[PDB]
Amino acid sequence: MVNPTVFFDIAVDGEPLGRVSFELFADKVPKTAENFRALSTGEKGFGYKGSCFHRIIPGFMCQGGDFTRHNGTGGKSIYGEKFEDENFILKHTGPGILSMANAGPNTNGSQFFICTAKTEWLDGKHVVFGKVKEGMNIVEAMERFGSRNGKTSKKITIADCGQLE
Numbered sequence: 001m002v003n004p005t006v007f008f009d010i011a012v013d014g015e016p017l018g019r020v021s022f023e024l025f026a027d028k029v030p031k032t033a034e035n036f037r038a039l040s041t042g043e044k045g046f047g048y049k050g051s052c053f054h055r056i057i058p059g060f061m062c063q064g065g066d067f068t069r070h071n072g073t074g075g076k077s078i079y080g081e082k083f084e085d086e087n088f089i090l091k092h093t094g095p096g097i098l099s100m101a102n103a104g105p106n107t108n109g110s111q112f113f114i115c116t117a118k119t120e121w122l123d124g125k126h127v128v129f130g131k132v133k134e135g136m137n138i139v140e141a142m143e144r145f146g147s148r149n150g151k152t153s154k155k156i157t158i159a160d161c162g163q164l165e
């Protein structure tokens with residue numbers, strides 16, 4: 001151990017954009033970090049590779065991780081279907097925060113978002129579990145394919161993903 005590092009290679013209608021890497025806070029939210037880690041390697045036989053960022057809102061966040069329905073209504077965890085909010089120790093303090101999307105309390109599956117700003121109104125509502133390490137420039141590039149309601153102007157996909165260490 002040590003907190004693990006995962007990467008995504010991002011593409012735009014298939015054209016490579018670049019690599020984003022994340023530190024996952026297994027020291028504070030081990031169950032949540034492990035879900036995202038395993039979905040990033042695909043070790044359970046499903047996961048993030050090939051999925052899209054379906055909702056990108058400039059100045060707010062980039063949301064993805066629905067690998068089952070590919071529209072924001074789907075996705076599942078490595079623990080069945082959904083799991084509890086683990087804790088809310090960490091806060092949405094600024095750009096680069098990685099946090100769990102949900103449909104209300106205790107409905108974590110696979111969907112997640114990457115903040116591009118401080119979003120303190122999500123504190124206590126979404127479980128923060130990591131941060132961007134490398135590639136914030138790529139997140140900023142992704143953000144530019146979003147819109148105010150979150151519809152993307154091109155398809156923003158996870159071409160590849162996995163664990164770095």
Ligand SMILES: CCOC(=O)C(=O)N1CCCCC1
Nearest residue numbers: 061063100101102103104113
């Ligand atoms: C910024 C994260 O957004 C979400 O998790 C999301 O999709 N929703 C927020 C919670 C209610 C349903 C809609």
